[PDB]
Amino acid sequence: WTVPTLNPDTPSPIFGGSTGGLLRKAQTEEFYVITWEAKKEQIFEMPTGGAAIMRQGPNLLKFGKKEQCLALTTQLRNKFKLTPCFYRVFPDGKVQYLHPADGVYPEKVNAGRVGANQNMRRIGQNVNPIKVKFSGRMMSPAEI
Amino acid sequence: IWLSGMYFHGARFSNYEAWLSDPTHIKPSAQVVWPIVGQEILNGDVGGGFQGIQITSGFFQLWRASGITSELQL
Amino acid sequence: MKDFTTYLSTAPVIATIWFTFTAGLLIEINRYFPDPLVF
Amino acid sequence: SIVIFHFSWKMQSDVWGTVTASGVSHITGGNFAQSANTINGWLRDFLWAQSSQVIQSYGSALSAYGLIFLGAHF
Amino acid sequence: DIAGLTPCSESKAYAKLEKKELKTLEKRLKQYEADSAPAVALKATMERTKARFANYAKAGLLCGNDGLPHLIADPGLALKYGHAGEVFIPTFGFLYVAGYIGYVGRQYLIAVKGEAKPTDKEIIIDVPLATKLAWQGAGWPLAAVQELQRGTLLEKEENITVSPR
Amino acid sequence: GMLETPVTSAPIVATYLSNLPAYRTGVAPVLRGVEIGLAHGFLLAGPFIKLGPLRNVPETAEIAGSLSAAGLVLILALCLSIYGSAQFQSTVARDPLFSADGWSEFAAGFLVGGEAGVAWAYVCTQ
Amino acid sequence: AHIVKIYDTCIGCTQCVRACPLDVLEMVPWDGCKASQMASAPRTEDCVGCKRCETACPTDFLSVRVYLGSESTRSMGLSY
Amino acid sequence: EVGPKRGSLVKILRPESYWFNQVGKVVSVDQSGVRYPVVVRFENQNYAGVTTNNYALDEVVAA
Amino acid sequence: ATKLFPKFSQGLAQDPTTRRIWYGLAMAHDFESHDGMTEENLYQKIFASHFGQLSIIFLWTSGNLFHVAWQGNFEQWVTDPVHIRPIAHAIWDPHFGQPAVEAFTRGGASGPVNISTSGVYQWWYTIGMRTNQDLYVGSVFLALVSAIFLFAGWLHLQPNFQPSLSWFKDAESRLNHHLSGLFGVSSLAWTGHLVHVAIPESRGQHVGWDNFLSVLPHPQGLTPFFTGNWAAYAQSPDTASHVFGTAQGSGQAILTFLGGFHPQTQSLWLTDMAHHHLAIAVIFIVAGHMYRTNFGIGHRMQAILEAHTPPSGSLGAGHKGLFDTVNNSLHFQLGLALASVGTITSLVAQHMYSLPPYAFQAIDFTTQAALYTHHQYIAGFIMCGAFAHGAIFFIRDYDPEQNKGNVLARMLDHKEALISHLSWVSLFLGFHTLGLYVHNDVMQAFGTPEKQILIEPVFAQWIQAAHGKALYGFDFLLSSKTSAAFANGQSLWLPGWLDAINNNQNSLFLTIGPGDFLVHHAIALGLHTTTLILVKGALDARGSKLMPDKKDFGYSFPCDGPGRGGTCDISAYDAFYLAVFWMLNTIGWVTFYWHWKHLTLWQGNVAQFDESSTYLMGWLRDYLWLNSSQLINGYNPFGMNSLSVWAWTFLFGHLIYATGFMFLISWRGYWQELIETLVWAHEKTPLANLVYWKDKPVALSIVQARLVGLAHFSVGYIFTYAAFLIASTSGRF
Amino acid sequence: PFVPPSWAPSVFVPLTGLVLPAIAMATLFVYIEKEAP
């Protein structure tokens, strides 16, 4: 498996437009682009409000935050049994692949994933805040 | 059941017949309380030789508009 | 009849009957013994 | 609540009242046009002035209303 | 007597209040007939008022400057001046009925806790068991004292859940 | 994507907005400020003159209204200056108005234009 | 950014990962349970703090915890 | 054979557990070297509506 | 990009929303949560903050003195302090019309002024102030003191002047110096002022800085003090015909213990107050030599704490390790200090209304009411803060390893029993007090006032009889003429005290009845419920069954999410939050009782309160509806008077309270969605999208919403009651 | 003497009410929005 590359010249689903789309953040900070493959033309619900028609083949959409892209991914996976993927696009043109990060969905275990933020103890074994006091900043006992 | 109760109260525990002969002085009343724990004070002097609670639902005016003149009809 | 008695044994019906009995007892006591302030 | 308050004050001030010889006397004396333009007028002439009947209703047939008036505040 | 109060049988404000109540009742009665329902009801209310005032004065209650009865809650003063019927005897009466209710409820919970579905018995009351426990609860103080003396009234600290401190 | 309607897509309203001084994109910011300030001070002098506390007394209603409008123009100029100082701190063609020097010159032009508009509205009622 | 931590009481039921609405958690191989999997949080910069993962955790006490930390555009879920 | 007998009643010793100092029935005990092999089922559900949990060998006592 | 504000939090400086400004303003004094904060730096910042606070206090006092000396009528009020109203300061407002100008022009001034209700006129008159020059000099002196304190605060932050961490932990030295110097020496100096200035000025003799070295406070001149004949200072006191401020009827004594009140000023004797300060000065100075600092003698508080464990083990380890958990925790010390200060503030309110210390203070009804209400509300807020800091101590500074088996750990060991019993007491008090009230209301409504339950407060009346009141007829202790306690004080202080307590025209142990009993139970209910909420929040601060790891989330956090059934308002901060409402309700009940009893007392009809305080309808009609008639008539369509400012403040408080209900009922989500729609509207609007925000607009956080709603609730509550109390008391008298 | 002039309120009240708060609000607003280097 290899990381996919965003194709900016990808057809978008048939939508008449809405007022819940992108804002100035997309032009000044970042935005997100979701792409998927549809077996047939089908009407789905847009996470920003309204009903759009996904075309047969590739489909590309833009959203203001990652939650909208994942909500659309969940809707396409649970209802139409599709496999969507999204990226984070910056105004300079940089594209960053986001989900599924390793090509496999995170709900199923995949080899090569290194565990992060894992504490080899339980909650009851956490120390008291007094032992964490006078640190660099506000730190919780779970951070150590 | 609620409407039947309103008609029954107007036919057995009211002063509608007395109010018909003097609707400008007698206060409409269709609820009487039992003489217990000193609550009988709520049975005010509404007029027409009757003691009770002055009702504001307007059933007396509605019954007068329908032509009801006796408690038997209610 | 067994199901009906079981329905009557439910918490709201039992509470209604018990409170009606208790209220009736207190009301009858205050009716036959009006204005009781001290023993 | 503001709607029913306006209705009560307007009816008691410019509509409802008794009829005398060459003149009509209202319940509140026509004080709506002069006092409903301020919040203080609504609090004093409508809420404080008209609540006298419900707070001194004890010992009469309307005492129950006063009791509910307190219970509703609870 | 106690706290500078005077007995209601000698208080002038007490008799004045009785006269005021009878006066307003008589004033309301003056507008009706002599053999009608409101007249009979008002006369019954007047007789009840007279009986209530005479019974309160006969009970030995103490009246203040307002002419209203005042209760004595101190057991020493109540037992020394004959005021135990105000706050002492009703105190023990409430304690008996309240402990009665609490003991019957506790017995019902302990009885249904050893069954298959105690929650089912909690929503659908077992009337025969509840009636039997309600009748057997008359000896609640003796039974409670016996349970406390045997150590079966309380639960051990090791069998009660607590927070992680 | 977005919603297009005849209100936001009519060529007449687009030309009207492009003709406004704020959307000129190519003139000096001080001139834009002078024009906007004059257009604002002229209309601002009205409410204080006809509704202020001294609106019934003669020969001083216009004086008090114009002074109040001048004070409001001064407050708005201070607001424009602090907005420019807190908005442009670092980093078609780029409009020079959206810059520290451009916005400062715009605020100064707005102050001069607003005071001139207030003074012109005062003498226009005499 | 918020702090998301996984504890050793995790049974690898993958319910927290399926309930995450911004793809913050994932499953990694492990040997401390029957499922041979463990939850992980390698993308905490995208966590908003909805605590849906804590709602989906069946262990007593929870195996995943979210401590609200610094707030940014991503953590506040702002689309503007 | 390690751990309590299946079907027996045990007391939970985990302080942060909802069923601390409570009695639960033993369902199964894992024979591997897992941290929490004992499976305990309880009659009363916790705040999350769960009635079962996993505990270590030293976190449960035969009571 | 990263903003400069706030400089103490790097995480907040990186926040691109409007939440950064709000959180930077609300976390400025939480030095423990600042970036790179150490213990030594923490103590140094607190030291500087203390100096700044003293500077602000002294500047405020100098401001009050300056305004009374400039725009007041102190020179005219001293001549006739019975019929002249004190002036706070002048009023300069261009919004005032002509009728408002002549309406506020009163008190003998030449323009609109404010009538002071703080009582500084009576206090300054009693301590010796007579002219405006004295107030001017005092104002300049306090301004100089304020500047000196501010400079001290700035100086103790610079190098070579920052105290070390070890200096801040010298508890024995600090306690010795505070007891002997800050308390004893200050009281001794105050005794010197009363003996040298206040007492001679009350006798018509001017004693100022120009002649205090040539004027003797006593005609015997320090000889009886050195020879031990101290009784010579109590000879020839002020008679019953003494006129305050003149030499008619004045005496020569400087240290007496006559007791009671002055027959004219209806206040405590100046000689008695001087003697009081001298005795407490000696006691505090002696107490200041208890701890060991540098001379071998004295105590070590650690030894006394460690040697105080019961032998049977009832208290476990006792107080072992309590010295370290208190000295190393600033929240523990702050909680103890706030608890003691709140109790002392309540004590001040009670003693000040019952035993007026300043001349002509009892006649000023508005001053008495305002002072009592002010101190009681301040005390309630301070008490809530004491418990809040106790919860903060449990979360941030409590160490179970160091406090193992001592009383502190045992409190958390049985916290369920404490919370359950507090709940039972509150439930019993609420059920019975409300039941008796509703019963009396039903009896009064049905026309049978003799059927209401009126329990006589025999215990409090018994105590009043023990103090000397013979109205109830118990005749024991001070009430009996043949008791040892009565005969042992007949030559020192019992005559004046008995004459004052048996007088029904003052506030010294007022006559009580069933209404007082019922309202006292309401007060008990309020105290127990507020204590239950605060204690439960402090004990459950480290965790509970719902949140076993609550201590890992800090003292204040929004919630733990909707999981596990829902965890709204689970933090200790939320417990304090809910307790503030109960504190306001409790102080409202105590101030309502105080104001109604004193209003009926001053009006000459105590029977009105005695007969209407037994039912809630009497409280709503005879106290709230009846006393607000003049208040709401401050401005009407026919004109206005000087009382219109209180009417405006009344409506102002109602508006603030109602505005608080908005932040209290509606929550974040709705507002965040609405703000998002507003963001879209601003971004799509021409001629307005050219102006953009620097911080992204977001709705207020859950914790911030609670704080804002509570602040509005409290502000509206305070302003509404203050306006009503001042307007009713001033208009009636 | 320390007595202020008769015109002192007519100058200090407008100052403390409009000039000083405007300057303080402007300086504080510029300080809050200043970006760190």
Nearest residue of E to residue C7 by CA position? E124
Is B42 in contact with D59 (Cβ distance < 8 A)?
A: no
d(CA C36, CA E55): 9
Chain I partners of J2 at a C-beta cutoff of 8 Å?
66, 69-70, 136, 139-140
Is A119 in contact with G6 (Cβ distance < 8 A)?
A: yes
Q: Which of D69, D71, D74 is nearest to D50 (CA)?
A: D69
Ordered by where they begin, the domains of chain E are 1-165 (1.10.8.110)
Smallest CA–CA separation between E97 and chain B, in Å? 22
DSSP label at residue B27: P
Q: Resolution reached, in Å?
A: 17.1
Give the 3-state secondary structure of residue H52: strand
Q: Which of F42, F105, F29, F104 is nearest to F73 (CA)?
A: F42
Chain D partners of I629 at a C-beta cutoff of 8 Å?
48
- Nearest by CB to I398, which of A123, A130, A141? A130
Smallest CA–CA separation between E150 and chain C, in Å? 33
d(CA E145, CA I67): 72
- Name all chains with 3 or more CB-CB pairs below 8 Å to chain F: A, I, J
- Name all chains with 3 or more CB-CB pairs below 8 Å to chain B: C, D, E, I
Report the largest interatomic distance among the alpha carbons of chain E, rounded to a whole angstrom: 77
Please enumerate in sequence order all residues whose Cβ is within 8 A of that of G8, keeping only pairs 6 or more positions apart, or say none.
A119, A120, A121, A122, G32, G63, H35
d(CA F38, CA F49): 17
Kindly state whether C33 is in contact with chain E, defined as any CB-CB distance less than 8 angstroms: no
User: Which residue(s) pair with A42 in the sheet?
Assistant: A54
Between CA I66 and CA I71, with CA I70 as vertex, the angle to 5 degrees is 115
User: Residue G55: which domain range?
Assistant: 1-80
Look up residue I731 and give its two tokens: 């208009």
Which parts of I638-701 fold into alpha helices (H)? 644-665, 668-683
With contact defined as beta carbons under 8 Å apart, do H61 and E159 qualify?
Answer: no
- Nearest by CB to I396, which of A23, A124, A130? A130
Smallest CA–CA separation between H58 and chain G, in Å? 15
Q: Which of I400, I252, I393, I405 is nearest to I332 (CA)?
A: I393
Give the 3-state secondary structure of residue I91: coil
Helix (H) or strand (E) holding F44: helix F29-51
Q: Which residues of I422-440 are buried (b: 16+ CB within 10 A; e: fewer)?
A: beebbeebbeebeebbbeb
- Nearest by CB to E164, which of H16, H19, H22? H16
Is F89 in contact with J35 (Cβ distance < 8 A)?
A: yes
Q: Which of G48, G60, G62 is nearest to G20 (CA)?
A: G48
Kindly state whether F4 is in contact with chain A, defined as any CB-CB distance less than 8 angstroms: yes
Is A21 in contact with F2 (Cβ distance < 8 A)?
A: yes
Task: Please identify among residues 23-62 of chain H the ones whose CB lies closer than 8 Å to any CB of chain I.
Answer: 46-48
With contact defined as beta carbons under 8 Å apart, do I285 and I184 qualify?
Answer: yes
Is H46 in contact with I549 (Cβ distance < 8 A)?
A: no
Smallest CA–CA separation between I475 and chain C, in Å? 28
With contact defined as beta carbons under 8 Å apart, do I547 and I570 qualify?
Answer: yes
Q: Which residues of I381-413 are buried (b: 16+ CB within 10 A; e: fewer)?
A: bbbbbbbbbbbbbbbbbbbeebbebbbbbbebe
With contact defined as beta carbons under 8 Å apart, do I626 and I617 qualify?
Answer: no
Does domain F11-124 bear CATH number 1.20.1240.10? yes
Task: Give me the sign of the Cα torsion angle C25, C26, C29, C30.
Answer: negative
- Nearest by CB to B49, which of E28, E32, E45? E32
With contact defined as beta carbons under 8 Å apart, do A51 and A43 qualify?
Answer: yes
Backbone torsions φ then ψ of A62, nearest 5 degrees? -120, 140
Q: Which of B68, E45, E18 is nearest to I450 (CA)?
A: E18
Report the number of distinct structural domains present in chain G. Answer: 1
Task: Please identify among residues 61-100 of chain F the ones whose CB lies closer than 8 Å to any CB of chain J.
Answer: 75, 78, 82, 85-87, 89-90
The domain locations on chain F are 11-124
State the first-to-last Cα distance of chain G, in angstroms, to the nearest integer. Answer: 18
With contact defined as beta carbons under 8 Å apart, do I12 and I27 qualify?
Answer: yes
d(CA F83, CA F85): 5
Report the largest interatomic distance among the alpha carbons of chain F, rounded to a whole angstrom: 59
d(CA H6, CA H29): 7
Backbone torsions φ then ψ of I584, nearest 5 degrees? -65, -40
Residue position matching structure tokens 């709201």: C12
Is I4 in contact with J34 (Cβ distance < 8 A)?
A: yes
Is B36 in contact with C35 (Cβ distance < 8 A)?
A: no
**G33 marked among binding-site residues:** no
Radius of gyration of chain A (CA): 20
Q: Which of I144, I265, I159 is nearest to I202 (CA)?
A: I265
Task: Please identify among residues 563-592 of chain I the ones whose CB lies closer than 8 Å to any CB of chain G.
Answer: 563-564
Amino acid at H48: A
* Distances from the Cα of F44 to the Cα of F29, F31, F113, F126, angstroms: 22, 20, 12, 17
DSSP string for I158-200: STTSPPPHHHHT-HHHHHHHIIIIIIIIHHHHHHHHIIIIIHH
Give the number of residues written for chain B.
74
Spell out which chain A residues touch chain G, with contact meaning CB-CB distance below 8 angstroms: 23-25, 29, 63-68, 70-71, 74, 98-99, 101, 106-111, 113-124, 140, 142-143
Task: Give which of B13, B51, B53 to mutate to test E binding, by max E Cβ within 10 Å.
Answer: B51
With contact defined as beta carbons under 8 Å apart, do I27 and I33 qualify?
Answer: yes
Look up residue H48 and give its two tokens: 């999350």
Is F3 in contact with A15 (Cβ distance < 8 A)?
A: no
Helix (H) or strand (E) holding A99: strand A95-99
Spell out which chain C residues touch chain I, with contact meaning CB-CB distance below 8 angstroms: 35, 37
DSSP label at residue C10: B
Spell out which chain C residues touch chain B, with contact meaning CB-CB distance below 8 angstroms: 27, 30-31, 35
With contact defined as beta carbons under 8 Å apart, do I31 and I43 qualify?
Answer: no
Cis status, amide bond into A100, omega within 30 of 0: yes
Instruction: Sort I729 into a burial class: Cβ within 10 Å, 0-12 / 13-18 / 19+.
Output: buried
Please enumerate in sequence order all residues whose Cβ is within 8 A of that of D10, keeping only pairs 6 or more positions apart, or say none.
D32
Is H15 in contact with A124 (Cβ distance < 8 A)?
A: yes
d(CA J31, CA I266): 56
d(CA I343, CA I13): 40
Nearest residue of A to residue G78 by CA position? A65
Which parts of I245-364 fold into alpha helices (H)? 270-287, 301-306, 322-327, 330-354
With contact defined as beta carbons under 8 Å apart, do B71 and B13 qualify?
Answer: no
